[PDB]
Symmetry: C2
Subunit: 594 residues, 2 copies
Amino acid sequence: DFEPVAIVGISGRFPGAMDIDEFWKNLEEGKDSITEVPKDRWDWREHYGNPDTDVNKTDIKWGGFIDGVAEFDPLFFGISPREADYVDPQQRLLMTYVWKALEDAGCSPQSLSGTGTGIFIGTGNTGYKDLFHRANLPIEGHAATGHMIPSVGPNRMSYFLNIHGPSEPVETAXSSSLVAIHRAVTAMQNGDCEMAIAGGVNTILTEEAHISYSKAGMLSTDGRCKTFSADANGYVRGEGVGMVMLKKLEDAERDGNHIYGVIRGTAENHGGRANTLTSPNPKAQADLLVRAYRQADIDPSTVTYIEAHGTGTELGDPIEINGLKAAFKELSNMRPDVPDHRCGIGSVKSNIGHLELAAGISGLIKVLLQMKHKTLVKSLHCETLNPYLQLTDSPFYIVQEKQEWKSVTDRDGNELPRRAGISSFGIGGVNAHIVIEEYMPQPNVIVLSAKNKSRLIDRASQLLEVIRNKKYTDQDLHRIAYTLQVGREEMDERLACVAGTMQELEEKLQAFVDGKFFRGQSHRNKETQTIFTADEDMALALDAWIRKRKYAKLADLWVKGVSIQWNTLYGETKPRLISLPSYPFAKDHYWVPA
Amino acid sequence: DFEPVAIVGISGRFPGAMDIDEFWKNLEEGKDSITEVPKDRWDWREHYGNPDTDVNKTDIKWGGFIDGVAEFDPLFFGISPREADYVDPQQRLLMTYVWKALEDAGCSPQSLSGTGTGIFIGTGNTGYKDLFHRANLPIEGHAATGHMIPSVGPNRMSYFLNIHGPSEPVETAXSSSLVAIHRAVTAMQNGDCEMAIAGGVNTILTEEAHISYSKAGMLSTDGRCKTFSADANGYVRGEGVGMVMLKKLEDAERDGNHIYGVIRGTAENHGGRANTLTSPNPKAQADLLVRAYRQADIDPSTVTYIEAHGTGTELGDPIEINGLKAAFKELSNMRPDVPDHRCGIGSVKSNIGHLELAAGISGLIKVLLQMKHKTLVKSLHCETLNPYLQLTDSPFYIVQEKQEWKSVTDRDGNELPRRAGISSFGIGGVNAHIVIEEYMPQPNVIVLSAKNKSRLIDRASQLLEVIRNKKYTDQDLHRIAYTLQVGREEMDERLACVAGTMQELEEKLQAFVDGKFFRGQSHRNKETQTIFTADEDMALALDAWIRKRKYAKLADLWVKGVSIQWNTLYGETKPRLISLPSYPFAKDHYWVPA
């Protein structure tokens, strides 16, 4: 054999969280982002009633909603504004956060073009087409690729990125975005592709799903996923989108990627004949886990955290726990390098609700963040545990309070990397499990570019705000410079400044934002580009400009669109890539036509 | 490494074709099954008009429709009649033809229970839910698993069969059921599952798809897929369902399966940045083919037939041909064991239209039948070839007339197995290709059983009609007997008769159908079953009954529900399984409630 996979880039938007940073902020602080259904979507009052006796009524007025579900920047993607009204927000959000995940990795689209890169996204029809019917709008040809065929989403981005790997929507209900990971890893092992992007997108656009699920007995009448609690009585629905970029580990180490964590094993199965169609199967879950850790070949006593599927139902939570206990017990007999095993269990659903198609990727992202800050955040609404869990004689405990994620120790007597598992189960019975292992590893020119002046200003403000918040030190200057130099598409509106410290850079960015560095437009300097064309002695001159570190002169040429081999500023081993703010797309509104 | 996969069972229903037999009948006779839209679905007159100028109108009144899209036998599958109204016909047809494919293989559900068998079906939302909205029906809890979540289809059958392999819907538009094959083969190579069922289901339930596709310029205003023709001007839409059972080749040879053909290589890619989003890419198609045949490791000059994607468009057909020419030319340079290479090209779409989700599986089934009858059937509507094909200096020719499929010869001087390729492309740019290689290999008790008396009579009539039509000889008696003995679920209503020739069997079946053999009900002989319980001396008695070939006595016990070890009637090497009529499900109508 199994070739471990590196997670080298992430992006996302969750309830109460605009980005990954604000998402971790909420988790660490134990925030609950479940709200009442906004009038934006529908009026919960107009559909209120007893679901068991009233026609088309539900008592569920809650959900985890995200901001800007209608926000899109169609011109960035070569889509006209008129056509953007017909494109399903499922696809719009998909394209946006795939790009963001690429930038977060520091992988330039140029580098991707022509490659066998795959895309596997949890997505499906979430009701956008129904809004067209309600509005009594004419059927148009735009609808075909617009919002009638869900696979157009991933396919649209493969077209845009010019990649040739498999491009699939994954739809296995609530396990979708985790099966997507499994499918991606699988595709990388067998040669189908070399790199991959995976994740999920989930949107709640009509009240129909709320009403049917309510009448089927799935939804909590409290509107909270009270996982592991004694009061667990159903789940609460949430919107969201998550993306991860995957590269083979050894490729990621050669290419100088920054790594969030390493996928060591994955597994996918089906529950077979259970009690009913929608009943979970503990035997199937235990077999799932065994296969995953057998493939990872890790001692089960090293796994210190489990992200449970944990939806917050009456008999769902104990069954999952039972599967866990049976799995580890079996893995112990099969092969004891850490005494007194203790493993925490939590569920991100207590914070943001059940993201369904995007549920799996929300779980993974939470775990990756926990590894970064070495903290196990609190699981919500479970002050009183379900008495049927019975964790007394097991390594497991619910993470009821925020705490340090302690690394366990060898029999040889030294620190092991943190290891964790995520589980996602569908109501149809499709189960997926993934095993994550923690990864164990003078002035310059700071360049920025964007499609237009407004976007360029937004890029500068983002870099500014992230610097003021001390998220970087002077130590990270050359990494930030290198990542912007080679890990960003060179767009038309450009900005460059020379800096040696974090303080100098902050001042020159602030000066630019204030409205007072080098500035230019690539398309309006065809004269200059013609002068600095490819010539053999020109190449010597540029090389000397680089060798003698004439940064201000190199920078002024660059903002005019002159190609600079930034690679030669550095020795054999380039600085390792670093996570920087991704593109600030225009927040323009596109929805159902008049 | 590559482990070749055996196709050991098939089933299906296509326009103008109730089953596989009638499907081959149509192909051999060059029948065109495209008809006008039946009043059953919608009134084409009520939506007629100029698509380019008229609101909600289309000039397309044609399509390839199948019979009994509303027919289901819910009690067979443990589904109540009331719930059957809410289950999408996509799922209903799925369950039906998965079972039929299993029976065709001679694989008993008992043998499947507990195994890691996967299910990968081309399916999606085709508009059943929209019929509920039109009818202004109340939202019910049944809808969730009924017709709102497409993955419930495959998952429902995995539940029913008690299998634990991956259970996914595959939706990559028009390449779906071929990607499904690819996904299945892939899952069998990497240990995800040991056996798999793959295929596609496509249904046309509302006029919406017709109108949008028409306004988008996809549909032929002649209503015919005139592939390779000079008159090619779009495709025609068709309904259908196809299923294949897949086993690892060496497992199929050990288990005594009958084999339709061997999958030697598969490939899946994406077209990347093409001319437009929906434009095909010849370079991507050529790379697809190269990978497939490189994996199959077969000399390209041995491939004598290609089932083109062949949709019948203006620039689609030449682009596909160009991809083929470039692919083979490249495969030649890479490594010449048959001089004067000639390879035929055809498209089943000329016969039945474009089955979309089920398009790929229709192509494969056509090819498998062609291998069985050693015949390349006529491609329709192409008396005048597209002048842009340019096949003069290539191995390729359109199969314009029915002809014998000649097997090519070695450089060593002897016959090679027939080899062929199927291609399926999606409008989103997802491409799949599969490489098939032809497979090169005294009275008894005939038992039959079913859920009820009516179904048992139907089973007997099917066996009767297939015997009268000389589809078997006396040579196949022990194979037919063995397949019914071990390759059928033992159901409640039973029928048994002793026979030594095909004539004797036909008479006793006819006698049963006439209303005049052994007969019984398993659930009403608990007394007899108690007497013939498991006892150690009872085992000796039954064994002697088998050894001394007391067939009439064994048969009378069997119809009363007494377990008979039919395995011991035969030596070490059992008779090879044989394709027999599959279950004749009740043709009861279930549709949108009042």
